[PDB]
Design a protein around this nucleic acid. Structure first.
Ligand code: MG
Ligand code: MG
Ligand code: MG
Lengths: 175, 203, 97, 205
RNA sequence: CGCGACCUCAGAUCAGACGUGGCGACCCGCUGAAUUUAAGCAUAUUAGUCAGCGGAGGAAAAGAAACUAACCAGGAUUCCCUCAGUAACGGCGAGUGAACAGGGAAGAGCCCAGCGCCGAAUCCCCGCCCCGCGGGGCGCGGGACAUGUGGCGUACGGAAG
RNA sequence: CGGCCCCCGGCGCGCGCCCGGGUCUUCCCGGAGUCGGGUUGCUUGGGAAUGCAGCCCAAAGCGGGUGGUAAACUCCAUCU
């Protein structure tokens, strides 16, 4: 639902990946201070979110990811269909978001089909841990039932209306 | 990580998931043209194990081929020869259908060079193949010296000569005791060497 | 007393023992790949010929069950390895319950 | 069409054979052509030897030929490994490498290893500008010739043993006969059968 | 109802490129007879040749083993001499008929997808410049491609840390 | 043989790129409507089917292919 998905993108917004504009200056600030002080470790932890099906699958089956946002409208759906079944087995929480265009704008691209959460900030772990029980209630714990749930198979409205009109005639037959 | 799962999921194409989306789109493919330019590969693992990369210059076409063997194009089934040549209706066309499918893809686009292709659905009448093509004159292809081989002019129209892995299966060549009907060069290059009279000068 | 014909044949030379050529270790299971194929037989399922096979292999008999896999998958030597891996699905479904 | 006592013949001239005829009138014209493809290659290279790299000692297959020694393709990894030289450095030394060859004998393994160390001790390299790692002074006093011929260390050299003279002793003029062939020839073919009758008396109880 | 994204697609005398046809001796992919021979004729032979059709190049095709072998084992392809008119095929008739060792010519090997690893570390296009001839860039700033995966180290002779 | 004019392959100043090898330990390791089987045509010396092609069925992972008489059992060889 969109209230959780807006809270999720609020959390993922400050973990935005590096763009080529800020990649120019980030290699400057590393190099101007190394030219001035030679820092042995200036930044111990730059945190970021990963992107890409082929990168996420490496993180889940190594159990390095902490929450796997997964998209909805992948055109060859077999690119993604294994991944909910796999996050159950490695126990990583996953959530299906609406629209692969919208999480593609997080990573400054068009479509990106998956992102992952590995190292959140420890002061903002408490926002990631807030909605993660709201998520693995809905996806991981329900896996015995969401694997059973068939889809489709409803007739069209011009043909289910004549179903109801036969049932009302059967309802008018009895009383 | 991803593509090993996509491979193994594809290799079971009778299970209820996979035989659904192999025919929810075999319908969708059937409604289009005989050949149609796909914007992106419909199975990106199998394209890239056949030589595809996702950059400017490569292009996929899915094209359609009508299934079945060939009928001998002869008026009223009258072939006018000895009775071993009354073969109107059991004739089988010794080159493959995928090699036919690559052939009428690189024929429409003669500015394009063809690498190879793969299978994306079959109905009872039509059979659908995605054919991958390469523009020899784009600078992402004309640089990158591990790609410069195809822009070298001996590779003009590779399937009309039978050079791709779909098409080279029909020539019957390879090493072995099972394949030395073509043990020099090609099939008729063996025949010319077996049937030449090699009379020397002092004989 | 070495000789050319018989049961101890040939010029008697000494063996060079060595670690085998690497391409001969080709179809091993390599446990990570065992994980991938076993993760995918529960997202995807069984083929329609082999769900009909295990409904003979639990009740009807096995000899008519192998003669069924003899016909659909090709050879005899492929039909037994398919049959004993269906009986191990049928054991893990029933006998681990 | 036949006649008196002669041969019955199958000439294969029932096919249009005048089109596929190959007459060798250019064959002196090509023998003087591929001499020039060797001479203008030999001076083209270097003082590096003509007729290419060094080949192994290789014994032929197929019982008719298994008693002789042939030059092979490449020395291979097992034989390169013991000699100490790297598998990709070996072909700029002048040593051909055939990685698909196997060693399953040890006598022929050590033969090509002895061959390959013998080569390197009669090889002189040229450092570019004279630093010379693993190489010494002036180049073997200008290397005693320039360029070799048709094989470096005479690659066939099919050699046999002397085995001069013995005295015919007892147990040697007594035993190892024709009968030892015929009995060993029979024991190879009655081997699987007699091990089947042996199972039959084991299930006899 | 409007707006934004993305996917699928359109249009244009868009900017910049490309393909077409010829020649066809040799070469590559298919298609393909009959005369003739068998003293007749159907299977066979002629012949996978003639004609038909499509693609190239200065050569093409092949080519680094899902090989040959069966013993003391050879080691990509192509060409020659043999094997050999032989094993085999065939109204077992007419006829047809390869290969492996062996001797030579020539000799040269390699790369990717995948599995992981590196903050996409990669490419195209435009603009002004370092500074240049006969124009191609490594250097600078913008627009795209690209995570549905570009680039690096890697390929079964093992590889990586 | 000489003299003329142009064109070409390769020594040395300035760009560009630049840690390999051995031993051990740990981890990685592969191409699917494909192989294969059926049947049906063609082809081949290839014969209980050498090759190819259609249609149907359709894999495995100490697996797979080959080992020239169909099959079951087994061992070994060889290739990937
Ligand atoms: Mg594009
Ligand atoms: Mg003569
Ligand atoms: Mg030309």
């Amino acid at each position: 639902d969109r209230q959780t998905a807006t809270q999720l993108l609020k959390l993922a917004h400050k973990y935005r990946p590096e763009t080529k504009q800020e990649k120019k200056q980030r290699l400057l600030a590393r190099a101007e201070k190394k030219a001035a002080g030679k820092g042995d470790v200036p930044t111990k932890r730059p945190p970021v979110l990963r992107a890409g099906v082929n990168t996420v699958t490496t993180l889940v089956e190594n159990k390095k990811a902490q929450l796997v946002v997964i998209a909805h409208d992948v055109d060859p759906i077999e690119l993604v269909v294994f991944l909910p079944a796999l996050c159950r087995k490695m126990g990583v929480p996953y959530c299906i978001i609406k629209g692969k265009a919208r999480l593609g704008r997080l990573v400054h691209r068009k479509t990106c089909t998956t992102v992952a959460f590995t190292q959140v900030n420890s002061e903002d772990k408490g926002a990631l841990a807030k909605l993660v029980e709201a998520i693995r209630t809905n996806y991981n714990d329900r896996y015995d039932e969401i694997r059973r749930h068939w889809g489709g198979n409803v007739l069209g409205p011009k043909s289910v209306a004549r179903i109801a009109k036969l049932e009302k005639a059967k309802a008018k037959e009895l009383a | 990580g991803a593509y090993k799962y996509i491979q193994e999921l594809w290799r079971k194409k009778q299970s209820d998931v996979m035989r659904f989306l192999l025919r929810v789109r075999c319908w969708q493919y059937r409604q289009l043209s005989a050949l149609h330019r796909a914007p992106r590969p419909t199975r990106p693992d199998k394209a890239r194990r056949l030589g595809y990369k996702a950059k400017q210059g490569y292009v996929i076409y899915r094209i359609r081929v009508r299934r079945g063997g060939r009928k001998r194009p002869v008026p009223k089934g009258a072939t006018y020869g000895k009775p071993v040549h009354h073969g109107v209706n059991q004739l089988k066309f010794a080159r493959s259908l995928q090699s036919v499918a690559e052939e009428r893809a690189g024929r429409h686009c003669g500015a394009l060079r063809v690498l190879n292709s793969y299978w994306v659905g079959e109905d009872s009448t039509y059979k659908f193949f995605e054919v991958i093509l390469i523009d020899p004159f784009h600078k992402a292809i004309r640089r990158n010296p591990d790609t410069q081989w195809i822009t070298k002019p001996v590779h003009k129209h590779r399937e009309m000569r039978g050079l791709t892995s779909a098409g080279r299966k029909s020539r019957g060549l390879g090493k072995g005791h099972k394949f030395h009907h073509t043990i020099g060069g090609s099939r008729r290059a063996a025949w010319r060497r077996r049937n030449t009279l090699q009379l020397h000068r002092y004989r | 007393y070495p000789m050319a014909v018989g049961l101890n044949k040939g010029h008697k030379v000494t063996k060079n023992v060595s670690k085998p050529r690497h391409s001969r270790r080709r179809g091993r299971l390599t446990k990570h790949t065992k994980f991938v194929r076993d993760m995918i037989r529960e997202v995807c399922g069984f083929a329609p010929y082999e769900r009909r096979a295990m409904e003979l292999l639990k009740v009807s008999k096995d000899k008519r069950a192998l003669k069924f896999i003899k016909k659909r998958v090709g050879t005899h030597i492929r039909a037994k390895r398919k049959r004993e891996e269906l009986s191990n699905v049928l054991a893990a479904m029933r006998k681990a319950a | 069409a036949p006649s008196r006592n002669g041969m019955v013949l199958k000439p294969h001239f029932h096919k249009d054979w005048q089109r596929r005829v190959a007459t060798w009138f250019n064959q002196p014209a090509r023998k003087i052509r591929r001499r020039k493809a060797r001479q203008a290659k030999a001076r083209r290279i270097a003082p590096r030897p003509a007729s290419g790299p060094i080949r192994p000692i290789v014994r032929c297959p197929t019982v008719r030929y298994h008693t002789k020694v042939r030059a092979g393709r490449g020395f291979s990894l097992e034989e390169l490994r013991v000699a100490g030289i790297h598998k990709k450095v070996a072909r700029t030394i002048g040593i051909s490498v055939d990685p698909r060859r196997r060693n399953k004998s040890t006598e022929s393994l050590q033969a090509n290893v002895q061959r390959l160390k013998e080569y390197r001790s009669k090889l002189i390299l040229f450092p570019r500008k004279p630093s010379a790692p693993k190489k010494g002074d002036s180049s073997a006093e200008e290397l005693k010739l320039a360029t070799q011929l048709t094989g470096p260390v005479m690659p066939v050299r099919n050699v046999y043993k002397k085995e001069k003279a013995r005295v015919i002793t007892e147990e040697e003029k007594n035993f190892k006969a024709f009968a030892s062939l015929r009995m060993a020839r029979a024991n190879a073919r009655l081997f699987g059968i007699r091990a089947k009758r042996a199972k039959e008396a084991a299930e006899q109880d």
